[PDB]
Amino acid sequence: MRKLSDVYKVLALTSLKSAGFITDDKVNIEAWGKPEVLAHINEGLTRLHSRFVLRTNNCIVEMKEGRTDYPLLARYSYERFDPAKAPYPYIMDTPQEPFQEDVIKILNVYDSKGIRRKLNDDHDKNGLFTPRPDVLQCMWPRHFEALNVLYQAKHPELTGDENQEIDLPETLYSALENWVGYRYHTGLNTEGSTAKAAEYLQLYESICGEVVDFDLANGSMSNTNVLFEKRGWV
Amino acid sequence: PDGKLPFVLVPYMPRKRELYGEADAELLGDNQKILGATMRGMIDLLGRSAN
Numbered sequence: 001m002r003k004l005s006d007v008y009k010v011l012a013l014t015s016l017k018s019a020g021f022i023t024d025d026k027v028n029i030e031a032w033g034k035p036e037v038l039a040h041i042n043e044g045l046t047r048l049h050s051r052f053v054l055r056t057n058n059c060i061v062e063m064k065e066g067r068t069d070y071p072l073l074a075r076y077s078y079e080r081f082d083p084a085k086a087p088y089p090y091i092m093d094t095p096q097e098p099f100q101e102d103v104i105k106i107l108n109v110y111d112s113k114g115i116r117r118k119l120n121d122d123h124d125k126n127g128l129f130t131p132r133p134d135v136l137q138c139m140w141p142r143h144f145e146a147l148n149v150l151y152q153a154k155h156p157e158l159t160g161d162e163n164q165e166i167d168l169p170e171t172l173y174s175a176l177e178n179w180v181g182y183r184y185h186t187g188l189n190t191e192g193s194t195a196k197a198a199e200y201l202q203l204y205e206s207i208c209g210e211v212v213d214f215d216l217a218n219g220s221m222s223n224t225n226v227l228f229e230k231r232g233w234v
Numbered sequence: 235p236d237g238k239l240p241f242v243l244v245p246y247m248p249r250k251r252e253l254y255g256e257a258d259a260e261l262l263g264d265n266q267k268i269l270g271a272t273m274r275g276m277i278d279l280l281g282r283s284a285n
Binding site: 231232233234 | 264267268270271274
């Protein structure tokens with residue numbers, strides 16, 4: 001689990017090596033292009049955390065009476081309650097692991113009783129529809145309820161602090177660099193730099209293909225066929 | 235007059251050295267299961283389609 005400070009250095013030696021903002025020691029990035037690079041790493045992790053299922057996290061959502069639509073934002077959480085934009089907090093997070101507003105796709109939600117509730121099932125009372133990816137529409141907020149919502153997650157936003165640690169598999173760092181190089185080299189609008197951006201972007205797919213061709217990101221899934229015994233079939 | 239219990243018990247398929255008998259559905263077990271699970275599969279194939 002590397003640090004953003006180390007990512008700056010490793011970026012300065014492999015991908016952004018001919019970049020202008022490389023400092024005189026060649027092992028760091030000048031303080032004028034760091035917002036630019038940080039805005040490329042954040043997008044880079046978001047893409048990598050979108051294709052592969054890299055971070056599966058669950059955040060429980062308490063039921064408040066009278067509210068059916070339950071946006072899974074950070075303003076409604078407990079530790080990050082924002083009284084100006086949220087009437088009451090209903091998500092539950094601990095101080096050490098607060099909600100980071102990092103929901104990409106919601107996968108499976110259980111209950112406080114252990115009953116699994118289907119997702120997007122038109123003919124299914126006891127079903128939680130999601131009218132938009134980062135929301136949740138429970139049509140019957142029963143008493144004493146909660147919802148462990150297993151969802152695909154993205155890396156928590158990199159504010160810019162050089163001591164924030166990055167959660168990426170070590171085998172996928174050769175693809176994050178090839179995406180930062182793409183974003184940087186494609187903005188210069190020069191013929192030489194643009195042709196390099198395509199090479200860096202295509203290499204991103206090649207490495208993202210070798211990671212999925214060897215199950216290095218846990219993409220293959222096998223499960224016990226519990227359906228067999230239920231449908232009869234002695 | 236016979237001085238015996240007034241019950242008469244006859245088995246269907248006798249069990250060796252046993253008073254009670256074994257019925258027919260004992261050997262027919264799991265055959266009904268497989269046949270029903272295949273008929274239900276065929277009906278599923280026909281009904282869960284678009285006609």
